[PDB]
Amino acid sequence: AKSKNHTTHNQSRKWHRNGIKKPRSQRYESLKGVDPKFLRNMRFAKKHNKKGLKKMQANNAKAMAARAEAIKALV
Template identity: 75%
Template sequence: GRLQNKMAKSKNHTNHNQNRKHHRNGIHRPKSHRYPSMKGVDPKFLRNLKFSRKHNKKVKIVVADKQPAVKAQQ
């Protein structure tokens, strides 16, 4: 063929050995946390949620019942 000065082709992509590396420690599901993040939630909803929690009397009664009466003993 004709002699041309062309640069060598460079590798564009490879996934070689990645699957083995991923499976070394096992592929796990993401951990589920107790309270999911409210990041990115509708601001109007968050404001209402804040006020509803603030004025929720049932929750306050339950929390007060669970706390030990340390102050009464002193």
């Protein structure tokens, strides 16, 4: 009582019926697999980004003043 062992006959048709997809590419991909010391220290950098907010806001205000002087000299 022998039988048929293995084939791939109707399989490509079955696979292309439901539309073989590219994987779900998303913006801001995950960090699973990145090396742990560099994940550790980017976590420290994201922890200490809140330090220096007054310097960042003041320098952004001076950059707005610089763009205002530039558009005043241009217009």
